[PDB]
Amino acid sequence: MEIKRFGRIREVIPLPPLTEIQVESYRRALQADVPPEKRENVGIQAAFRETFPIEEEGLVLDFLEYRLGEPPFPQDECREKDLTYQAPLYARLQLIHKDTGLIKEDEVFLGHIPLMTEDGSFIINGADRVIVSQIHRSPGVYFTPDPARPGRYIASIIPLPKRGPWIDLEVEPNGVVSMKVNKRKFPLVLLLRVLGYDQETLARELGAYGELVQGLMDESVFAMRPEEALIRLFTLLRPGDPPKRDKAVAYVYGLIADPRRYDLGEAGRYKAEEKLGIRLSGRTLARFEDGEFKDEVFLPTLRYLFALTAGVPGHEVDDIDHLGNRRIRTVGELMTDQFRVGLARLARGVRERMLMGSEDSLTPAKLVNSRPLEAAIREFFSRSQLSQFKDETNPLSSLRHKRRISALGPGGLTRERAGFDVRDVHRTHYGRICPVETPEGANIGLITSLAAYARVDELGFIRTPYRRVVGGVVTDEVVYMTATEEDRYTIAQANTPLEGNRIAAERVVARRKGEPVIVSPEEVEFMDVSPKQVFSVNTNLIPFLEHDDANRALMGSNMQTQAVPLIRAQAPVVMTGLEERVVRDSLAALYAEEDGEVAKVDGNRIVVRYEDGRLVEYPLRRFYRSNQGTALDQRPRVVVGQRVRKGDLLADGPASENGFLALGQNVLVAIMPFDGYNFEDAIVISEELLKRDFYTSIHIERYEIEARDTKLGPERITRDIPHLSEAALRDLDEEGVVRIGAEVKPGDILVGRTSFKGESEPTPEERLLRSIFGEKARDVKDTSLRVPPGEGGIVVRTVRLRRGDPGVELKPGVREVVRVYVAQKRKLQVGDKLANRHGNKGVVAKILPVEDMPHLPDGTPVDVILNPLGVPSRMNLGQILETHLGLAGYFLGQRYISPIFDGAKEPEIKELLAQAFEVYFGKRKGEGFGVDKREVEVLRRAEKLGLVTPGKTPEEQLKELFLQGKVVLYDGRTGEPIEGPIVVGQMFIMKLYHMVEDKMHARSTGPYSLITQQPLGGKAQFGGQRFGEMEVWALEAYGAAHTLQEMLTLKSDDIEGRNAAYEAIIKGEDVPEPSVPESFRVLVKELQALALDVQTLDEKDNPVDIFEGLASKR
Amino acid sequence: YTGRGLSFLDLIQEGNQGLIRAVEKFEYKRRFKFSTYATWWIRQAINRAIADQARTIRIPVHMVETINKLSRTARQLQQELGREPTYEEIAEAMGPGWDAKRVEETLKIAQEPVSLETPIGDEKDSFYGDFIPDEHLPSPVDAATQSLLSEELEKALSKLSEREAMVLKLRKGLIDGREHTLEEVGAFFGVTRERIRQIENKALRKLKYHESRTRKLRDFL
Amino acid sequence: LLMGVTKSALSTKSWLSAASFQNTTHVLTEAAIAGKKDELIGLKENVILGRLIPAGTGSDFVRFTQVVDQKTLKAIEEAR
Amino acid sequence: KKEVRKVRIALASPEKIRSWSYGEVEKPETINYRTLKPERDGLFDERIFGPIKDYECACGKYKRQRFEGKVCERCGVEVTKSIVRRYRMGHIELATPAAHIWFVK
Amino acid sequence: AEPGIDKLFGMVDSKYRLTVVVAKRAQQLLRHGFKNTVLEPEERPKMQTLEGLFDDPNAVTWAMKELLTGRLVFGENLVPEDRLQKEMERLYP
Amino acid sequence: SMARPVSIGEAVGIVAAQSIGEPGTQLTMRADITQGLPRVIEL
Amino acid sequence: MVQVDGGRFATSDLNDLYRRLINRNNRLKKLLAQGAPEIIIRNEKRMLQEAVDALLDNGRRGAPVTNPGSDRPLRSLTDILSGKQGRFRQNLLGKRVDYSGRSVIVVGPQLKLHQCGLPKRMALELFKPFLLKKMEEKGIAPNVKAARRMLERQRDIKDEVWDALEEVIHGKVVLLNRAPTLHRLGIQAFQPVLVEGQSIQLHPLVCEAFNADFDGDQMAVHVPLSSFAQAEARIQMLSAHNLLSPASGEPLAKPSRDIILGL
DNA sequence: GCATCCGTGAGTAGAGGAAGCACAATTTAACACTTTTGTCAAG
DNA sequence: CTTGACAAAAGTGTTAAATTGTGCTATACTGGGAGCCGTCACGGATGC
């Protein structure tokens, strides 16, 4: 099956590594392999040098270097034993006695740092997790207008999150310039005096504006000494505390000048220098030295504010949603932030220990307690909003998870308090953030995806590539630039016609600061690389995207993440060209390292002898269970003695076919209504799909149980369970565990367990019963593990962990734990959900035998019938064009690649359909068959519909219908043709994760809640359905008083009523009258706890007791 | 002493009680300053109040001191072994009278209860208490089988004589709820102790004979 | 007087229905000082207590209807 | 018997609050840390709020239904149903009066 | 649609009175074991079983059919309720 | 719903609230945004 | 204060709020008996007032009281009754109920307007007490207790049980509900037809009132128990008896989509 | 006329989720012994 | 139906050992510590 490629645009660079946002950021933070003397002041190395040295204020503790050790356990062992994949951390510290001059050095153990796997994830307590990148406002200096009063501006200084307070500079109506700090507004001159600024200094530079400088010229504080001004400022900041200079300088220096408390950031310092046109020595607002404060940023910020208000041409306001003002915090920065938090706590315990207890006899190891540091790191990797359970339904699911961008999390926005403006598609999103891939609902615009060609720079700003255009010719030089840098040029579109490298069009479509213009070739300065750089990886997998509405393209890209792997999965007939790279970068398949020869091929491992002579053996993951329950295994694709080149495929991974992404099947589709089984998105399929094992997938479930120590005695896992027949114990081995290979059904025992009965004398009726049969009560009871309703399959694995085993950390009191893995093979059934890449989805409602399906004149039946009424109002025409191209490939036996916005057009599709008709109809004529009597009838109507040309021969009119994608179709039930030609072709359809097998649930009675005594919720708990307020309104509008009362009392929490109702039904009686609900009794008691006397009365205002006299004091 | 289960104002008020005690016992003849002696009494009151009020389930003072010593030992071994110690290393360092079983039992005692109102997930509509069933009140199924058993047992007893059934009910405790001695049944009817034993045993034999002919009573067992 | 839907519902006579809507602390503190008595007139009050709502089949216009056949009706009337 | 026709809410006096309660809670103890049984004069005391299982006292002298309405002379626990533990209230006697925050803020 | 629902709605002033009459009649049939019915043997509702035709066990279905024959009397304050059940129990023990 | 005089005992208040509120909710989930829902709430 | 299945204990926030008040109340008594100065006594009394405020209404005045080692405020008595999560709106105006189920919906074009398709497996659990009585009436089981054991294991269920379930539901109706329930036609009554499979079959002409379609929608099922409840559902709530709109008086169950296109 | 304070924001489903020590008081367990209570054999 | 038995299951002091509750320590020491703005926006009621 050959592959045909469309398109004209030639890409000069390939896609970057698709997981480099995760992988490269975490390597920079750790610097694990860089020698200690060559390490740069980034990552955790920068955190060590910030907290150290620690001084008592004559003892000093200093930091020299660190190193990372080998992990204790491998990745697969951590998954099986529920461990964390980590590495020990060691620090090399020295203690110096200032009074004496004696030094001691030793290496102290600091704890464990989690390690990232090769694909870019973590193993935390045995589970795979992903750290999601966070977007937030960049630090710096910003100028925005005053919303209340026109012509006025506000200057803001923003540090890194939790690294200082915000500073506001505003010109008050009275003319006084004010500075607001921590919800408190005070005149700026008071602080501006502390920085040693006199009346002669201020008016020299800012006096060239007019009336604004007069508001900074108060003589009440101008003569005041900076020390007096310092104390006065302290009183305003925190009134009530005693004014002392020692306390005063501590507060002012620690608010704007302490590097350990205020941090502008590398990005913030870079932004401040670019805007104000200054150069900063540090990352603080002011610099304290020689016993005085010196200004660094306050003066240049004030000059910009005054000049902006005056109206100088060169000063403009800032757009806060501009992508040059928003930056990304990746996993390395997020981890390092918590590392610095926990390190500051460690230094706080060092200080309290070095001034109390054996001061003369100290060692560095005795001072350092690393418990605070380990708790900070453990908390981040377990209970952070950005640390999420990994999505691995298919290899594409995990790739998308690693490129998501979230505005939520600690230091971010909130879902409820986010407005419209922060959710919009900004013009700078072009080439950096995908405009279509986002969740619908409360998270729309707050979670997004990185563009396919984008990359995050060292300061956290997203850049996109462009090609340099000089003198009308396009060069291959590629420049990555940010949004702020991009605004200065005229950028042409990627589809601009070229004659080699020369621009051929006279009029060129271009962007200037985000808006379309028409320009001459001599005005162009840059060019787009490809149309693929505007969208994300998921959106780039949808062919004919230019013919689909964006609201339905959002559904198509999202649902590709939910497709489950199939045992006979195949690659789509029509592809875009990203299917190979997705499989390669997901690390799910196996490739050869260099040239060699295959020596051994097996279902478990492959051995390759490379041309240098060395043998490398590759084990294969087989029948592994993912986080979502889908089976992940690798199948070999080579034979013994086969020569391979570097990068050749060795074994396919899940949902791949010869190295291409394979999320479904290619089926024959007819577009027509069918007897109402297609009604409102429902789908009809053929029984022939089941016969050849299409849409068949494998799922694995895990079950667990524990044996504990109790006061009454230990629980025992055993085969000898009381009161059980041999039919129940048939599949258990001698240890009480089900044998491997057994078939289990609901109610079957998996692991047998007994527990010691609690001390309780029996009821009198039971005592007489035991006397009659002469049976002695046992001391243990059945507590074994059984299959839940609606589940089952084949037992494929057992795991047994015991106390004392190496690496096993069981909780106190737990003796052993047993785990059982059960696998089932699922075929397509009524109630299962199907979808295509253009957003068309629906559940299977009918399965028909093969002789019932519509069929071609040569006897071939179709596989799927889709309703044409779902197309017009959704405006997703891409599925129609995919069907037309799939019809040509069905007869020609070829597949196609059509890139988005540069691909297959109708004249090319119609030229392929003309070749396919010559084999679809020319074959018939050679075999000795003409035109059917039934086809002549359909042709007669077809020219009354204006579909064919009158006067042509039947063969010529059948070809006219084929070029429109339509054929004559016969009815399987009657043998007569459909009255009009029907669109028939080949389409790629996926089977989604949502199956009716996992969702059907029912309940009669079961567990109840503790306090309210109402039924529990959830299928996993065997809970009932919530009958909420709006449901109660519907029953009231119907006038169904007795039906409403049953749900309120007899079926939720009337304890006496629900017991009597059950006993009446099993006796063949009608249910009795209900009584007071229990939750009303709770409300009365809770109101009495609030010292409120609530009483129920009768017609005569006499009290009525609703507690049966159980709560009345005699 | 902050961060150990009590608020800062609670620690201050507990330390004020130690200062009051120090005034009573202070002696100025010794020429020592007040803060030298009062510091002993102020620390003692704060430390004792922590060991008595910081836990929902109170643990005695001596047992609290054992738990604190056990935590110090494991911290020292952890920084020496480069990893978390096992229970056998902890027991050996604690001293004589300690084995791995005693270490595990002490750690089990030192566990604090968890709140029923703690959320799970991001959205605040799910809490711990929504997943904990109540197992004290009988279910509707269990209440019905109790009454079905009593009704079937009453019909079987009708086949017996008047006194044979009445003696059986007294002995088994079906009337008052509590069983009565052979003598106690004897005093009710005016008969001897040994008479009850044979008549009570005879009624059982008749019940077993009918039971085998109807099989209306075996399922409840 | 004219007032909106929120103010009209919060100034209702029954404190049980007003306290289950909004502003529970303000409603309960005003009812307790006045010693208010809820007569269970509307639908929400009866739902809270699990009573038969006074609407539909639970209304007093149709609730007390009797049904009888001729055989039992002739016997009662003749013997009376 | 009688049907509920009205519900009334009012303030509760100190004298009415003392008539509700079955005893005073004097200790902040919940349960013993070893036997897992309620402590005397605590927040889960059986002598105040009732027995934990039906017709069974704390000491164990009585274990059956025949002594209904009786109070053990050794432990002081009424021999009754354990469901009264959902309905019986206690009280705390304050050393100084305190205001109700509903009638203040 | 229930058979004869249009005629049933025309026999009462309020649609909720029809539901009250039907529900109380069905309770009477259940309590006396269908021995107080006003239907003739050829009018009894039937259900099809693997073993043959038998009486319909649904009492609500019986009540609706009886009410269409015109042999039932309904109203308010017809007879004392205690005296109604005593006579009906005596007639149908 | 029946095209006939209303029967005594119907909760017409609940029906009125559901009749007014339903079209507003479905319109939002499917102009109602501007000068639509806000104007109704203001009235 | 309950012990969970694993041996761990769970307790409510009210216990910690009571413990704080008792501790402060007892300390004040001892301070008064020792003749403490007025500065110490005044501090204790101010702490006692604040402890009562936290028990009644935490966070109304001042900083909320939190459990040590955490920033989550403790739940007070006022929080228990108020809000969307409070006692009124969560437990008194709406509840969770017995005899209810849920599944995915598909279209049944062969149904009548008053019929629906119900899976056998769901109906066995939904009508369990009725089925237990029916099984004992025949020779399937000797008593109700033996009947319940037979249904626990799937491989022990005989073919005659499905015939008995057919006679249980003769004439009965169920309630179908789709969320959100915007008007009263979000709940309608149907006569069930037992089907093979796991999805609920829905009539084409009731989809507009439910605002339902077949791309993943799920629905709930309920069973009315008594004769009053069944009579109300078969007379007032039946789908075939509700054809016009209560809001406008125009037909609500009417031809749509492909039914219009064919005609 | 305006500054300050306070309560409100749709439904169902899922699926993960840091002191010692000495010594007095009190509780518990061990161990005998006395008394009560069934069985057995008569009779 | 009642006697004589007959060991056994249960009840009753007695006491040593775990376990728990409480007081005490004498160089001099005398006012906390974490926060830290897309601070949510709008209406109603109260007090100046």
Ligand SMILES: O=c1ccn([C@@H]2O[C@H](COP(=O)(O)OP(=O)(O)OP(=O)(O)O)[C@@H](O)[C@H]2O)c(=O)[nH]1
């Ligand atoms: O957040 C949500 C989303 C959806 N829904 C409920 O689910 C429905 C989903 O409706 P859809 O968005 O699927 O659209 P539709 O089927 O009405 O579109 P057409 O076929 O007419 O083109 C909504 O109309 C609402 O009933 C919610 O209640 N809440």
Ligand SMILES: [Mg+2]
């Ligand atoms: Mg979603």
Ligand SMILES: [Mg+2]
């Ligand atoms: Mg739809």
Ligand SMILES: [Mg+2]
């Ligand atoms: Mg839908």
Ligand SMILES: [Zn+2]
């Ligand atoms: Zn007792």
